[PDB]
Design a protein around this ligand. Structure first.
Ligand code: NA
Ligand code: NA
Lengths: 98, 98, 98, 98, 98
């Protein structure tokens, strides 16, 4: 049950809408090769959270990390818009649902 | 119900007062043409949260994001003072109520 | 009740001590004329939270906002040292109590 | 009680190990000549939390603030390596305990 | 247990995967010899959280510290990828598990 606004914003062949995901793992990694921020779902799916140096994307990425860590802490579900082209798929948008 | 203070400030300007809103979705988006931070109400109404690069407004915008996210986690209601100029309407002021 | 330390530091020449305040609203506002961060108590008293652009005061002002929002979320009471020279009165020190 | 590691790092005559402290107030002050962040224990003990502009102490001092806040909100105890003179004392290290 | 993703990435013979660690202390230290951020587990094992002055690694190390603090606050277990060459061992990746 992603909002219709969230669905409308991720409605293209080059992006994957994924709905009602339970995230159960939140990962920070600064190892070589695998550095980044990730989440893993109850199913075992993995996404990478985008990072960005400057404004405005640095506001949105910081909020993606807060959404991700709140979902893992609370068990709230998220809906995601993600790039299918990248492995793990990179999150382009995320929706935290009560 | 909105504080008299908050109602008076919103009544100064042409923006519209919205009371007792229950926010159920919080969105961060870095897609190409819908980038931003947004909230979705229990009735499906959508608003964008103000963005600002610089001081002092970036203080207030950061707190609007925290108020948004707290309302979504807690189910606390919010009152908004929202501009109709844009789609979705932009939150110019918000009040978290316990 | 306010700590002796908090009370001793609130210089009565320049400010007044307010004890055992229950804050029930937290407001962020970016409108042109009512610009700022505020709190509203259970009795309708309003106060403006101080902001600063530079270190070190912006460490303290960030923590005033965290105390304010935590009090509204939790119902924990605060004590304030507030200047009466503006309306709303401005908070120059705040003490969150467990 | 304090970890052996924490005790080991605070084992000198000029700083005191203080264990099982209940913090019940958390103060932000920007007033003339008392500005700073402080905590008050259940028995009336006062400490200033250190402040630092630059890396790496800006990381640790920000974490000391979050530890103090969390202790006040949760009632979790802390252990401190602190100065041994009259209140208010300074803090060299702080351990939040579950 | 560790996600398959997490386990796959802790793949240097010089590194150690530790699973299902319950962290019970979170330390901020600004002493001269021992400055840093640490966690202590329910069995007394100690680790140092990595630090980084600059983007991008400072995004991940900030999230390491949020993961550690959340774990101590909630009792949620963590999985770590850590380096034995050090005393205390240094965390190069960490997975918070709901
Ligand atoms: Na006075
Ligand atoms: Na000592």
């Amino acid at each position: 049950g992603a909002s219709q606004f969230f669905k409308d914003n991720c409605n293209r062949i080059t992006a994957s809408l994924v709905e009602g995901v339970e995230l159960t793992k939140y990962i920070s990694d600064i190892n070589n090769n695998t550095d980044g921020m990730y989440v893993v779902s109850s199913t075992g799916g993995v996404w990478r959270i985008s990072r960005a140096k400057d404004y405005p994307d640095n506001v949105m990425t910081a909020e993606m990390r807060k959404i991700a860590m709140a979902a893992v802490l609370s068990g709230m579900r998220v809906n995601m818009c993600a790039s299918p082209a990248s492995s793990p798929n990179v999150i382009w948008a995320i929706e935290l649902e009560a």
